[PDB]
Amino acid sequence: GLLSRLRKREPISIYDKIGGHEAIEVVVEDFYVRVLADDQLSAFFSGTNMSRLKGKVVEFFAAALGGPEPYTGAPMKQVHQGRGITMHHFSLVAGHLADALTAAGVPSETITEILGVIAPLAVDVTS
Amino acid sequence: GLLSRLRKREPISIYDKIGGHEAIEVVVEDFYVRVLADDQLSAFFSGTNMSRLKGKVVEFFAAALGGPEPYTGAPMKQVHQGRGITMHHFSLVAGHLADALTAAGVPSETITEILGVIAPLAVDVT
Ligand code: HEM
Ligand code: HEM
Ligand SMILES: [C-]#N
Ligand SMILES: [C-]#N
Ligand code: NA
Numbered sequence: 001g002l003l004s005r006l007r008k009r010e011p012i013s014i015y016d017k018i019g020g021h022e023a024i025e026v027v028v029e030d031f032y033v034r035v036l037a038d039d040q041l042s043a044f045f046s047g048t049n050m051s052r053l054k055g056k057v058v059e060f061f062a063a064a065l066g067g068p069e070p071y072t073g074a075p076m077k078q079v080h081q082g083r084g085i086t087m088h089h090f091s092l093v094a095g096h097l098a099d100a101l102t103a104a105g106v107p108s109e110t111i112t113e114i115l116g117v118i119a120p121l122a123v124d125v126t127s
Numbered sequence: 128g129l130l131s132r133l134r135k136r137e138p139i140s141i142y143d144k145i146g147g148h149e150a151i152e153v154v155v156e157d158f159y160v161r162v163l164a165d166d167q168l169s170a171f172f173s174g175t176n177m178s179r180l181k182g183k184v185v186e187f188f189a190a191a192l193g194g195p196e197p198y199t200g201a202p203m204k205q206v207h208q209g210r211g212i213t214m215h216h217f218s219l220v221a222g223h224l225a226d227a228l229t230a231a232g233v234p235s236e237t238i239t240e241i242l243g244v245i246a247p248l249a250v251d252v253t
Contacts, residue, residue, distance in 0.1 A: 030199075038205070095202075103199040 013066025014114060018106055021062055021069065027100050028058050034096035041092055044083065064117055077124040090122045132195070140193030141240060145233050148189055154227045155185050161223040168219055171210065191244050203251035217249045 002016045018024070032054060035041050045053075056073035063071045073079075094115060101111045129143040145151070159177060162168050172180075183200040190198040200206070221242060228238045 034201075037201075099202060103197050105197050 014110065014117070015062060015066035018065070018101075018104075018110065021058070021067060023104065024058055024062050024065075024067075027097075027104050027106075028054050028061065030103060031057075031097055031100040034099055035093060038092065038096065041089065041096075044085070044089070065114065075124075076121060080125045082127070085126050087122060087126050090126050094118060141237065141244070142189055142192040142194035145192070145228075145231075145237060145241075148185065148194070150231065151185050151188050151192075154224075154231050154233075155181055155188065157227040157230060158184075158224055161226060162220065165219060165223065168216060168223075171212070171216075191248075192241065203248055207252045212253050214249060214253050217253050221245055 002012070002020070005012075005016070015024075018027075032050065036045065036050075056071070059069060059071045060073060062069050097118065098111050098115060101114065102108070106114075129139070129147065132143065133139075142148075142151075145154075159172075159181065163172060163177075186196070186200060187198050189196060224245065225238055225242060228241060229235075233241075
């Protein structure tokens with residue numbers, strides 16, 4: 001954990017400073033409340049098992065930010081290919097992520113930092 | 128609370144200045160009495176959970192006035208989007224808020240200061 005990494009003189013990851021796996025679980029749950037109540041986005045998840053998705057997305061986000069847990073889901077490009085997702089849709093999703101993070105009390109400088117890991121992903125996500 | 132924040136040498140916020148979460152609860156309560164009695168605004172709130180709206184609006188105001196807790200609701204543009212709210216409507220709402228702050232005993236200078244935090248939010252709301 002964070003304690004073990006500190007004794008190895010490893011720098012503190014984004015994962016660690018926001019609160020590890022438990023913090024990410026709570027953010028992702030609020031994230032999807034937001035995304036599904038947005039009628040610009042809801043129709044994308046019409047045939048989606050949401051419990052399974054939040055499972056994979058907690059895994060993906062935790063790995064992207066420095067966590068030790070493996071991502072067990074499918075490649076980003078493969079999943080989002082041909083779903084008609086534009087940059088408008090990506091930006092709206094990204095916006096709900098920032099909103100979720102803000103609501104969990106994450107400092108805004110750290111949120112900007114997370115958006116910087118996330119923004120490049122649009123290349124695989126969008127059409 | 129305010130006592131904790133003064134021992135951390137945080138300057139006094141509008142939130143703590145006007146009386147904290149409890150004082151804003153009382154203001155927002157009287158605020159929507161004024162809004163729902165105004166014929167120019169009443170119809171927007173037909174079929175809305177007022178209890179739930181109150182909770183979110185207290186949370187918003189508290190955070191806009193420099194309080195300790197994050198706003199956890201929806202952004203101002205998204206929530207008010209597609210509702211046809213005009214500057215005339217926003218101004219009536221801000222006037223009702225000013226009048227509730229007055230009734231609560233908040234000094235004129237601090238209401239003016241609160242309206243300076245609020246007024247810019249019209250870009251999003253309208
Ligand atoms: C912001 C960057 C994004 C990340 C990090 C992300 C992450 C993920 C992950 C981990 C999965 C699960 C893959 C699997 O099942 O193996 C997934 C699936 C999915 N994504 Fe995203 N995603 C992003 C953006 C978007 C956007 C912008 C949309 C459209 C608005 C979208 C729509 C979907 C849908 C509908 C599924 C599930 C399909 C299904 O199985 O029903 N994603 N995403
Ligand atoms: C003074 C600036 C204003 C602030 C700070 C404000 C704040 C808020 C907040 C926090 C919410 C709830 C967001 C959520 O559910 O997550 C909301 C919703 C709403 N507001 Fe405002 N608002 C303002 C001005 C106005 C104006 C001018 C109108 C119309 C005349 C209006 C009418 C509404 C309506 C109809 C809702 C939706 C309630 C529902 O969920 O059905 N607000 N507002
Ligand atoms: C993926 N949402
Ligand atoms: C909300 N008013
Ligand atoms: Na509409």
